[PDB]
């Protein structure tokens, strides 16, 4: 039961279900203590059973319980657990993650097979703690806090922080991903080259593997953090190490479109 920024309150349906259960239980106890006739007691016991049923699994037997003034059924615990929007599929088998971004993609014909063009601002945001450590190491900022305050304001950013960032990403790789991920080649590791602008530059030879084209497609970027993660990305999921299809054994990174035409 939280207060929104404007002072209003937002609550879960479970609170209303629990309130109904408690109210009916208390009224049943009061009615039992008064020696009420058996018809009234039978009604109250039926209502308590329906309240428990609605709390555990609403919309299963009879008409689902709704809040007055709306036709929306209240969300029970079973609804919380199950379904495509339920806990298992939405928060356990898949999560939202930090150190990630997204942008429009543009062809990168001058790139090598293992490289991708990453925007400077995106890279600064993605590698921010590493940049703070490197800036502390150099003389750009006396400490991590001052470095963070410096990087907060755009007009307070200078030339040497870009060189520090270029030193931060040396040798590291990032993960590029295009939805829908139909096979394992929908995620691939690339060495980032820092570019100007706000578009990710993609090698032409991986577009088929991604099923990607350049009429508005967007791709997501993720940063593996630890030494194990970086080693796995550089050795196993690097684009230049994945040249044959795991399904058929045929080459998957191969000339297409303009290259075939010219040859």
């Amino acid at each position: 039961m939280v207060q929104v920024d404007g002072g209003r309150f937002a609550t879960s349906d479970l609170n209303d279900l629990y309130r109904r259960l408690i109210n009916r239980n208390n009224r049943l106890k009061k009615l039992l203590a008064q020696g009420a006739p058996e018809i009234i007691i039978r009604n109250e016991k039926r209502m308590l059973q329906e309240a428990v049923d609605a709390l555990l699994d609403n919309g299963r037997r009879g008409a689902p319980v709704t809040n007055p003034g709306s036709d929306r059924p209240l969300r029970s615990l079973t609804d919380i657990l199950s379904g495509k929007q339920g806990r298992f599929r939405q928060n356990l088998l898949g999560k939202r993650v930090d150190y990630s971004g997204r942008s429009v993609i543009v062809v990168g014909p001058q790139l090598k097979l293992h490289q991708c063009g990453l925007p400077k601002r995106m890279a600064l945001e993605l590698f921010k703690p590493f940049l703070l450590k490197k800036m502390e190491e150099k003389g750009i900022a006396p400490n991590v806090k001052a470095a963070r305050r410096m990087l907060e304001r755009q007009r307070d950013i200078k030339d040497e922080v870009w060189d520090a960032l270029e030193e931060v990403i040396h040798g590291k790789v990032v993960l590029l991903n295009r939805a829908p991920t139909l096979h394992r080649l929908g995620i691939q590791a690339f060495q980032p080259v820092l570019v100007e602008g706000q578009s990710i530059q993609l090698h032409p030879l991986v577009c088929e593997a991604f099923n990607a084209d350049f009429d508005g497609d967007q791709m997501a970027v993720h940063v593996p953090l630890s030494s194990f993660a970086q080693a796995e990305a550089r050795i196993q999921m690097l684009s230049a190490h994945n040249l044959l299809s795991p399904a058929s054994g045929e080459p998957l990174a191969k000339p297409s479109r303009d290259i075939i035409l010219g040859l």
């Binding site: 018809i39 039978r42 009604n43 039926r46 209502m47 329906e50 037997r61 009879g62 008409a63």
Partner: peptide, 11 residues
């Protein structure tokens, strides 16, 4: 069977 209003009214 269902619709407890009908059951209570009948009783």
């Amino acid at each position: 069977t269902s619709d407890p209003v009908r059951q209570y009214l009948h009783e």
